[PDB]
Design a protein around this ligand. Structure first.
Ligand SMILES: CCCCCCCCCCCCCCCCCC(=O)OC[C@H](COP(=O)(O)OCCN)OC(=O)CCCCCCCCCCCCCCCCC
Ligand SMILES: CCCCCCCCCCCCCCCCCC(=O)OC[C@H](COP(=O)(O)OCCN)OC(=O)CCCCCCCCCCCCCCCCC
Ligand SMILES: CCCCCCCCCCCCCCCCCCCC
Ligand SMILES: CCCCCCCCCCCCCCCCCCCC
Ligand code: SF4
Lengths: 210, 322, 162, 60, 129, 150
């Protein structure tokens, strides 16, 4: 119930091959991989990249009234090499899609992508000539956030979802020994999981109340 | 190997290894403590989820940094690029290697002391210069040039700020300096020397407000932007042992080192060093970054004549009471 | 201590030889810092602790500004390296190599003819150097300060942009 | 520069250090998501649902 | 004596374990973790767009005079380093000579400040108006 | 009642920043005046072209239901005319210029934004300065690129 991606530059972005494979997981190697995944998911360094409104809401989440620092994700490096997470928070404009592609290429694996906002998910409200309809047209996105703008705790919830995704994924421990393909778990969708608690809602508070 | 001399040599080696392990572990723990203390200063908590109080956040960061891809660019000079984190990690550690933490607990009881600290700072500048030049980047080039200007500014008067303490102790040995303060701590007679050494010692580690090379807002992290993997972690750990070294050096040359009225001496040394570490986090959080041209103007026109006048006054006071 | 002196002399010799026959200025400066650290080790071996201390303190400041001028002037990628490579030719360096060799032979022969008793390695503190520097050797200090003032004035006058 | 400017500036820096220390001695203003639930106004525009009549049938 | 040899061995072991820990840390960083295969990996970071030329161009600097003055003043500083460790035994004559020394230093610094040296700021702003 | 902050004749970064601080204080004064004295009336105009119509009248009247139905489906039909409204925005002066062809859409929408003019001014006021001065000038313009490019 996993998937495998293998990357190779040498036509159409993304330059990768994905297939549906089975989890291979080893009395010590499995615990070693679990420890590596724990260390990776408990320390994420997001990239200081911003496009639009959604970046302003992301750095609103970065502040002292929500404190995403508690998850170890406040480091916010401005260099792609030092970063460990690309949060596309804003509109993927036509003139910036090469820039975003370049900044994704300068980043180093282990790398993850979080689309924030409707513009980054699908193009959003701007079905216009000068906007790429969704940032996933050329880069693989790990976690999607609906919203315009998503509230800061929605970004925090997406960060925790990315942490659960990292905690159950298989990556090569060393680049000299073993397979270099990336295994990502095909987790159950949050829509299916939350259908049990969402349909049962009966009464809400009327809008005239504060 | 059964002889009192050989077991004494082995005990001294074990004490030096214990000191080295403790200061490296304390530098990493104080990186974590900088995160927590910046949270406290900025009305938040910081990382308090990985274990109890976030105490396992450092282990997770170490795991990520070890298993991050260590990247050497093709357009860079590989030997210099690998050499710069080595200098950044080791120079301030050797600067710490002369600090007496307790009576009978010192690695090397050198006859030079603060001369060795000046030597290690002059060697530590080459880490930043080589990181700026080797990485083959324009932002790194500007950061290296700014670091060179800041180094001019502080190293024109760092030793002269320390010469008041040197003249008061009358020797270059570290233990003589910490024994000359048995009556009065050296911060009160050497106060202008104290503030000038504070400015120069913050400029040693390039900490805020003197973060001209690695300025996040101005040059987008500066010289180590091509740096990644465990080399960037080495840069972090090296700067943090630099902060520990400068804090312990102020403790030894201005607050008696280990000397205290009631508590055991290592406890007093630890409290004063931790207070100066807290002051480093506070000096990062509190006041903004000045322009490096005004920084160099302040370091040349203000600090250097003040150190010279303070040295003259200290010499006159010393020869008056003789 | 004897081994430290010999290995630091060997490191200084090799690093200086790499300095004088290198085409990369920054690499040559790095080997120069290595050579000066080896010279400092030689100084610290012989009991001249102050000499090695000042060899690492103020020469590292001196090579620092040499590095600033190297990055300000010379670095243009490989264009400096090939230009320096076409300059250095075999006959060009074997010209004065025999002159330096015979000069070294003459100086070494003159050195070997002196009486020796071995350096005892007794350390000399900075307090004795401070006593002698501000005692018998006062006007050396004062007119050397005037010398540094003259060098500063000349550096200002010639180094100006306009 | 003017010595009065230097003294005024030094006083300003120690004053700013004092305010940041007093901030450190103050109350934290966080909202511990997701340990405590995020309060929302009733007219908040979040997830979209289709509702039912009081008699039980869908209102669309 | 015994304590000097013990401290020399402790210093040597301190340096050896420091370089060994740093090299082992670099080796563990280099050998653990997978590598990458990307088109624009080996491009210098200039904020997402390519460079106009290279990063190895002839960069100007305005710090040249201050660099030479830094070297000169560090030599005067080493003279004061030699003086300061033996102030008590030098007596008042050494104090007078060092006062003349520091007065020449101060006169040189005032000469540098007043003539326009140590002032390389661009004439546009200069923190004016 | 609220005062207007006017500088001394030069536009420094500091002058702009403290003028914005005084504007914040004036906005606090306006909010206090609005809070202490608040009317008790309608929240929508009674004009037939008010879009959308009031909700309760939509839910239990048929003329209002017709008006709401035709105003959310095809859109309100403004007559063929030309209008302009210039206001003081948070970052300068923002103006809307709307030409209607008599249809339910805008035939022409022109949005004038102040950050466009500030960004065009930028080369004439930072030339000859440092990169640090350029950074401080960028921080003291109060611009966003959505305002610039629209
Ligand atoms: C290759 C690796 C580096 C090799 C060169 C540096 C290490 C050389 C070996 C030194 C081993 C320790 C030793 O022999 O110490 C003896 C001596 C101790 O000092 P001293 O007081 O004069 O001796 C009398 C003792 N009661 O020591 C001395 O007198 C001086 C010891 C050497 C000088 C200090 C270290 C210089 C390092 C230079 C590094 C250059 C770049 C590499
Ligand atoms: C590789 C190096 C291995 C260790 C080499 C020996 C270290 C100890 C040493 O050099 O000791 C000599 C001297 C201290 O001698 P001291 O105790 O003052 O004299 C006897 C007291 N009457 O201490 C010194 O001379 C130390 C000063 C030089 C240290 C250089 C350290 C390396 C610098 C370059 C790093 C790259
Ligand atoms: C926060 C404190 C940082 C200290 C950095 C340096 C510590 C070096 C290791 C010291 C270990 C020995 C401590 C003293 C032992 C003898 C006295 C024991 C009773 C107090
Ligand atoms: C274009 C100008 C180039 C000038 C190069 C000068 C090179 C000089 C090399 C001199 C080598 C002398 C070798 C020893 C000669 C015999 C001993 C001295 C004469 C008796
Ligand atoms: S999704 Fe909305 S808030 Fe986010 S960038 Fe687009 S318009 Fe702005």
């Amino acid at each position: 119930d996993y998937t495998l991606t293998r990357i190779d530059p040498n036509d159409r972005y993304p330059l990768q091959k994905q297939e549906i494979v089975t989890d291979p997981l080893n009395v010590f190697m499995g615990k070693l991989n679990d420890m590596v995944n724990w260390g990776r998911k408990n320390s994420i360094w997001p990239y200081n990249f911003g496009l639009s409104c959604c970046y302003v809401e992301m750095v609103t989440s970065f502040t002292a009234v929500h404190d995403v620092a508690r998850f170890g994700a406040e480091v916010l490096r401005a260099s792609p090499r030092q970063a460990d997470l690309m949060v596309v928070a804003g509109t993927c404009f036509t003139k910036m899609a090469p820039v975003i592609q370049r900044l994704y290429d300068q980043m180093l694996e282990p790398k993850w992508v979080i689309s924030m906002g409707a513009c980054a998910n699908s193009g959003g409200m701007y079905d216009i000539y000068s906007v790429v309809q969704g940032v996933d047209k050329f880069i693989p996105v790990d976690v999607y956030i609906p919203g315009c703008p998503p509230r800061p705790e929605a970004y925090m919830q997406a960060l925790m979802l990315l942490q659960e995704s990292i905690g159950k994924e298989r990556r090569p421990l060393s680049w000299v020994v073993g397979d270099q393909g990336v295994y990502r778990a095909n987790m159950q969708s949050e829509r299916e999981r939350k259908r049990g608690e969402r349909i049962a809602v009966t009464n809400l508070r009327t809008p005239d109340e504060i | 190997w059964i002889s009192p001399e050989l077991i004494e040599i082995l005990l001294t080696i074990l004490k030096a290894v214990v000191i080295l392990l403790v200061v490296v572990t304390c530098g990493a723990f104080m990186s974590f403590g900088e995160r927590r203390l910046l949270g406290l200063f900025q009305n938040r908590y910081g990382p308090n989820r990985v274990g109890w109080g976030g105490s396992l956040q450092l282990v997770a960061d170490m795991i990520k940094m070890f298993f991050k891809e260590d990247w050497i660019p093709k357009f860079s000079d590989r030997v210099i690029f690998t050499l710069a984190p080595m200098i950044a990690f080791t120079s301030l550690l050797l600067a710490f290697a002369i600090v007496p933490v307790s009576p009978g607990w010192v690695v090397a009881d050198l006859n030079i002391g603060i001369l060795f600290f000046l030597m290690m700072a002059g060697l530590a500048v080459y880490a930043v210069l080589f990181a700026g030049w080797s990485s083959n980047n324009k932002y790194s080039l500007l950061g290296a040039m700014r670091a060179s200007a800041q180094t001019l500014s502080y190293e024109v008067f760092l030793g002269l700020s320390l010469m008041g303490v040197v003249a008061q102790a009358g020797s270059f040995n570290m233990t003589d300096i910490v024994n000359s303060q048995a009556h009065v701590w050296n911060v009160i007679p050497q106060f202008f020397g104290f503030i000038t050494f504070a400015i120069a010692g913050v400029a040693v580690c390039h900490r805020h407000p003197f973060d001209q090379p690695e300025a996040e807002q101005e040059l987008a992290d500066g010289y180590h932007i091509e740096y990644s993997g465990m080399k960037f972690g080495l840069f972090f750990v090296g700067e943090y042992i630099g902060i520990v070294t400068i804090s312990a050096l102020m403790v030894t040359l201005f607050f008696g080192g280990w000397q205290g009225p009631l508590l055991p001496p290592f406890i007093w040394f630890a409290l004063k060093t931790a207070f100066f570490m807290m002051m480093f986090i506070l000096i990062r959080a509190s006041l903004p970054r000045p322009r490096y041209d005004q920084v160099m103007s302040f370091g040349w026109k203000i600090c250097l004549p003040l150190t010279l006048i303070n040295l003259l006054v200290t010499a006159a006071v010393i020869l008056w009471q003789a | 201590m004897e081994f430290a002196f010999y290995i630091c002399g060997l490191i200084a010799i090799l690093a200086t030889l790499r300095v004088i026959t290198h085409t990369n200025p920054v690499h040559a400066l790095l080997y120069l810092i290595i050579s000066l650290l080896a010279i400092s080790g030689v100084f610290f071996s012989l009991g001249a602790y102050f000499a090695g201390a000042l060899e690492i303190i103020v020469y590292a400041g001196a090579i620092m500004v040499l590095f600033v001028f190297v990055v300000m002037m010379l670095n243009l990628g490989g264009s400096e390296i090939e230009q320096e490579r076409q300059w250095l030719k075999p006959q060009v360096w074997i010209g004065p190599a025999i002159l330096s060799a015979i000069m070294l032979v003459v100086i070494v022969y003159a050195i070997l003819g002196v009486n020796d008793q071995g350096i005892d390695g007794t350390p000399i503190s900075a307090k004795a150097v401070g006593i002698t520097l501000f005692g018998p050797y006062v006007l050396a200090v004062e007119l050397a300060s005037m010398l540094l003032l003259a060098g500063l004035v000349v550096a200002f006058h010639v180094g100006r942009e306009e | 520069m003017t010595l009065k400017e230097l003294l005024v500036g030094f006083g300003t820096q120690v004053r700013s250090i004092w305010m940041i220390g007093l901030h450190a001695f103050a109350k934290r203003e966080t909202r511990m998501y997701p340990e405590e639930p995020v309060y929302l106004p009733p007219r908040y525009r979040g997830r979209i649902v289709l509702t039912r009549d009081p008699d039980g049938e869908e209102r669309c | 004596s015994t304590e000097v040899i013990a401290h020399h061995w402790a210093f040597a072991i301190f340096l050896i374990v420091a370089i060994g820990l740093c090299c082992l840390m670099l080796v563990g960083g280099w050998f653990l973790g997978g590598r990458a295969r990307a088109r624009s990996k080996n491009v210098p970071f200039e904020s997402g767009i390519d460079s106009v030329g290279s990063a190895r161009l002839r960069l100007s600097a305005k710090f040249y005079l201050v660099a030479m003055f830094f070297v000169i003043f560090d030599v005067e500083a080493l003279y004061l380093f030699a003086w300061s460790t033996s102030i008590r035994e030098s007596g008042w004559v050494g104090f007078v000579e060092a006062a003349i020394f520091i007065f020449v230093l101060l006169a040189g610094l005032v000469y540098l400040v007043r003539i326009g040296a140590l002032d390389w700021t661009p004439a546009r702003s200069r923190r004016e108006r | 009642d609220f005062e207007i902050p006017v500088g001394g004749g030069v536009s420094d970064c500091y002058t702009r920043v403290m003028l914005k601080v005084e504007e914040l204080r004036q906005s606090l004064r306006i909010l206090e005046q609005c809070l202490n004295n608040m009317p008790e009336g309608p929240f929508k105009a009674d004009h037939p072209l008010t879009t959308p119509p009031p909700k309760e009248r939509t839910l239990q009247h048929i003329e209002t239901l017709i008006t709401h139905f035709l105003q959310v489906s095809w859109g309100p039909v403004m007559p063929a005319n030309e209008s302009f409204q210039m206001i003081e925005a948070t970052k300068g002066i923002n103006s809307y210029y709307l030409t209607s062809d008599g249809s339910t859409m805008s035939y022409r929408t022109r949005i004038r934004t102040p950050s466009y003019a500030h960004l065009q001014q930028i080369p004439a006021a930072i030339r000859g300065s440092l990169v640090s001065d350029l950074i401080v000038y960028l921080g003291s313009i109060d611009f966003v690129m959505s305002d610039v490019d629209r």
